[PDB]
Amino acid sequence: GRVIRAQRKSGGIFQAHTRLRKGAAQLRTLDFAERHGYIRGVVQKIIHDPGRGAPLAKVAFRNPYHYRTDVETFVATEGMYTGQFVYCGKNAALTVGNVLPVGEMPEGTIISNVEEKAGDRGALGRSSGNYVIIVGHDVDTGKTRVKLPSGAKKVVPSSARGVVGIVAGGGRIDKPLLKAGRAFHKYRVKRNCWPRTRGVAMNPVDHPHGGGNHQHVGHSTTVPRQSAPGQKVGLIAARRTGLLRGAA
Amino acid sequence: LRPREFARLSHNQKKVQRAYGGCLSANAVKDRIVRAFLIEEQKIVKQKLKQ
Amino acid sequence: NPLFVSRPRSFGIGQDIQPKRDLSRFVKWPEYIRLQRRRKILNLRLKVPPAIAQFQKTLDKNTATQVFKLLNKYRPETAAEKKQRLVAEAEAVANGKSAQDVSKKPYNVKYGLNHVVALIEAKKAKLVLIASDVDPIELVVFLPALCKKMGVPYAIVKNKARLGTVIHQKTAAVLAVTEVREEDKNELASIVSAVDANFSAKYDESRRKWGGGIMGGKTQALLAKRAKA
Amino acid sequence: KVRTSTTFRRPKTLQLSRKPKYARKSVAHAPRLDEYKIIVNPINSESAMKKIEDDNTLVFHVHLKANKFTIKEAVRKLYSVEPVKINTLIRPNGTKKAFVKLSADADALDVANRIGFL
RNA sequence: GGACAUGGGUUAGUCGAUCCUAAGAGAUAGGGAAGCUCCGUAUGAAAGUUGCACGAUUUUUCGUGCCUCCUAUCGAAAGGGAAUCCGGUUAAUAUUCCGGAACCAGAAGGUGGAAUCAACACGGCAACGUAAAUGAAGUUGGAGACGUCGGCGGGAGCCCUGG
RNA sequence: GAGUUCAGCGCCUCAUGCUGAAUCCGGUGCGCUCUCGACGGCCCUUGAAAAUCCAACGGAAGAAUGGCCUUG
RNA sequence: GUGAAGAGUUUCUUUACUUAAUCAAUGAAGCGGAAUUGGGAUUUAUUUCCCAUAUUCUAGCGUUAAAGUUUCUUCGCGAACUGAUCCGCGUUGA
Numbered sequence: 001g002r003v004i005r006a007q008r009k010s011g012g013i014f015q016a017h018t019r020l021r022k023g024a025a026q027l028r029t030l031d032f033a034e035r036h037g038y039i040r041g042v043v044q045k046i047i048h049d050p051g052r053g054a055p056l057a058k059v060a061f062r063n064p065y066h067y068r069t070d071v072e073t074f075v076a077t078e079g080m081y082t083g084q085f086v087y088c089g090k091n092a093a094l095t096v097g098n099v100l101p102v103g104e105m106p107e108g109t110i111i112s113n114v115e116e117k118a119g120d121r122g123a124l125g126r127s128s129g130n131y132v133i134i135v136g137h138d139v140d141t142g143k144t145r146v147k148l149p150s151g152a153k154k155v156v157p158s159s160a161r162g163v164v165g166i167v168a169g170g171g172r173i174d175k176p177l178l179k180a181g182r183a184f185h186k187y188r189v190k191r192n193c194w195p196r197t198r199g200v201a202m203n204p205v206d207h208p209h210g211g212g213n214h215q216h217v218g219h220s221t222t223v224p225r226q227s228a229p230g231q232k233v234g235l236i237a238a239r240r241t242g243l244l245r246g247a248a
Numbered sequence: 249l250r251p252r253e254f255a256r257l258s259h260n261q262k263k264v265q266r267a268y269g270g271c272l273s274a275n276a277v278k279d280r281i282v283r284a285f286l287i288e289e290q291k292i293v294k295q296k297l298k299q
Numbered sequence: 300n301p302l303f304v305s306r307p308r309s310f311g312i313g314q315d316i317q318p319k320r321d322l323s324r325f326v327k328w329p330e331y332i333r334l335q336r337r338r339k340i341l342n343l344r345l346k347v348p349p350a351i352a353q354f355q356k357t358l359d360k361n362t363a364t365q366v367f368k369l370l371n372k373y374r375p376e377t378a379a380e381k382k383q384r385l386v387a388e389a390e391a392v393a394n395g396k397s398a399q400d401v402s403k404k405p406y407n408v409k410y411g412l413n414h415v416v417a418l419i420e421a422k423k424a425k426l427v428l429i430a431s432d433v434d435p436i437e438l439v440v441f442l443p444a445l446c447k448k449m450g451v452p453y454a455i456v457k458n459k460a461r462l463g464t465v466i467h468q469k470t471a472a473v474l475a476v477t478e479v480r481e482e483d484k485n486e487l488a489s490i491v492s493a494v495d496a497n498f499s500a501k502y503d504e505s506r507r508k509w510g511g512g513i514m515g516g517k518t519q520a521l522l523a524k525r526a527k528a
Numbered sequence: 529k530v531r532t533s534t535t536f537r538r539p540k541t542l543q544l545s546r547k548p549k550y551a552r553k554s555v556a557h558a559p560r561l562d563e564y565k566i567i568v569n570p571i572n573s574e575s576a577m578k579k580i581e582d583d584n585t586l587v588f589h590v591h592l593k594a595n596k597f598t599i600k601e602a603v604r605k606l607y608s609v610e611p612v613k614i615n616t617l618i619r620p621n622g623t624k625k626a627f628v629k630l631s632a633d634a635d636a637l638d639v640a641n642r643i644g645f646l
Numbered sequence: 647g648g649a650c651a652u653g654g655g656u657u658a659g660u661c662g663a664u665c666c667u668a669a670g671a672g673a674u675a676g677g678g679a680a681g682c683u684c685c686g687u688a689u690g691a692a693a694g695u696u697g698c699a700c701g702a703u704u705u706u707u708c709g710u711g712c713c714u715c716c717u718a719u720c721g722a723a724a725g726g727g728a729a730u731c732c733g734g735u736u737a738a739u740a741u742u743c744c745g746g747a748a749c750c751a752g753a754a755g756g757u758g759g760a761a762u763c764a765a766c767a768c769g770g771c772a773a774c775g776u777a778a779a780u781g782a783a784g785u786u787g788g789a790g791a792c793g794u795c796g797g798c799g800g801g802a803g804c805c806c807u808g809g
Numbered sequence: 810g811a812g813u814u815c816a817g818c819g820c821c822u823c824a825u826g827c828u829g830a831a832u833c834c835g836g837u838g839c840g841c842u843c844u845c846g847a848c849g850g851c852c853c854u855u856g857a858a859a860a861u862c863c864a865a866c867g868g869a870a871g872a873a874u875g876g877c878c879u880u881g
Numbered sequence: 882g883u884g885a886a887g888a889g890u891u892u893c894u895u896u897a898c899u900u901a902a903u904c905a906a907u908g909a910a911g912c913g914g915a916a917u918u919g920g921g922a923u924u925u926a927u928u929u930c931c932c933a934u935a936u937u938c939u940a941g942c943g944u945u946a947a948a949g950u951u952u953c954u955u956c957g958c959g960a961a962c963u964g965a966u967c968c969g970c971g972u973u974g975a
Contacts, residue, residue, distance in 0.1 A: 306948070312936065325912090337971090344970090516913080
């Protein structure tokens, strides 16, 4: 046969389009000021990052060791404004836009850009309108239980930092794209993944679903998890199929 | 002017005779002066009242 | 004087730029510096076999000073001394007897690993001085056992460079004393007695004493704090 | 041994200069393109004649590696005339042509007469 | 005759390349690979060009010391960019030649002017202005530097119209 | 003083020269091309980088002496 | 690899350690422990059983040290301590 499109997406023309992107959205390097006290920064810009629904925030801090200022690229939280003072550290106040360790915050708080490990500069809850809820704590072997946007429950060390509030950008998926042009423009600044040709519309050489006098798969679309590349197409390791008629 | 056309000008033609002249506007300079004075006065007040 | 006023800096978190402080403990050192420091750390960790840990025990300052004072009186001839002796021997040989008629019996410290090992096997070395910093340790790891088997006094001393200094070399792995003068017979006997009271008398005990095996560092204090309460 | 920076940098070494025990080349080469390799021949075409008689400029066949400085020096020391401007051309045949304008105190016609192509 | 033969013809500090970087290419450190070579571009590197008068007659770039998030290059004749116009001239070149009239960059300091009698100007309420109006490191800011469509107003050239 | 138009003299004319005049006064625009200025609409599309240049905060350094003949 | 338990002269498991090995970040930028310290409990008291930090300001600025002694015995913008408590096997975290 032939190498399928999924196998062909290893790079090259399938890389992300990052010319217009302004920078990574890392929180900050976990330093002495954030570990022991707090540090004050000023939000000097709130800008639009192409390919990302949520806005980005350029925040200027003061270097504690050298005569210099450092500009960060926080993920903008809803309600943040330019000229606002944000505080990052263990002793920061429970205010929207501040970055605090998860272990220094009560139960039920809504946060964003949460670290999986203390120092990775934000991993969880970064897309627009998404947030992470702090479910509980455990002082002995200090670890915090949190609820992720997908409903999963994750345990993190009680030193990971998170931003109080919700990622700015509100509900973006509520508006229909309404035409291929909007879909074309949406994915143009993201990558070469649009449009998509159905496998049953191809030939047997191209896709496992191609061929036949009628457009049909001919075999179960649910494929095993331990499937070789080139045949891991369709529904991979599907626990169940059909309409989700009641789920939690 | 173009970026390198400023090199041919004299100093006074690229600057306004004021603090931060040629880098900040007059209103911005006035706001900075007022903000600096007020915050320092309140810092002195907070220090004195902390005893 | 009124103009001279105090302008202190708080240097707290988020207040003032921190002053210049020593950051050596946080400096990313070069690879060779890191290797030679983590090496000593690794030897401090782990259970060291007794045949290697026996070299961590060394003569104290006074005995080492006495030993080296004895060594300095018996040192190999330098280039000038060798040339002068050869010139005198050549001059005397032409118009007299052989070189033995003008040259006295030498008295110097024997050196060289193979030569010293042969002397110990031949029971001719009355004192053996083993360097404690031989990088390939297999060269001298058997020396204490060989000396104990042959019944000759052996001591472990630092600074293989210092051992080589007496023999006018950059480095000596082991030094051997075989013959000494009458005026130094008592000094050699006292040195032998002091050396035997520290190494030969404890050879059997040192065969079963494993070295290293210390956690140290921060975890030693952590264990102490945990065990205190 | 106080280190105020969290980085190690290589110290400064003497870096002694070269003091060779023998010269790699026994004899130094003669100056290449001095004057005579620079100036090959004059040009006496109809356009060249018009340039000499009207613009007070001489036309030459300078070497490909000669620049407007070496051409000026070669002209000065070969014909005792001070150029004021030099224009350089590379002909379609691959050879370099030079337009050398003389000062107002020197007539190109008599200089060309002295050279011997008139 | 764009054919054949013989000669002639392309003139630049200001036009481009050259400089910079984009997508990318690609040494070096290092790691794989039997190897041809592959990955890798401050990457797990002792990756220094630069800031400062300590010697220094006496009015100055020559050997130390202490130093701080620098860094290979290639990659656009449509991207960014220091600076030239008119008239004329040839058989064939011209913003390149000629005549006239300019501009930019770099180097020394050749003059004149300005401030400072005992060190770094004045005026205006202010927006700000001048012929000058001493400014090292360090830091900050701006220009370079930016989509598409639609109408409105102006200017230049062209078009039209009266003598 | 250039260029353009017209009118004459030489009359082989040689440097193709010399000598006369004009090149003036007005107006117009939902006009065409370019450009500038202030705006408005659209984006789940917000629409390069660098070289280079400039400005600011800051205070390193300076030495002219005899109210006048004298320096940076 | 190192130390503790357990099983009817032995190796099966867990329950801990890091120095092997692995992951992540950084200009390997403040890790651990001592000494001072006062709310604090012992208790006719002793930090003895206990953890303590300096900047919430509104879109300003914060660098090339001021001060205190004391070496010179002040051309000194001259040297040192201190201002900036002390010590160390570990760049930090998992």
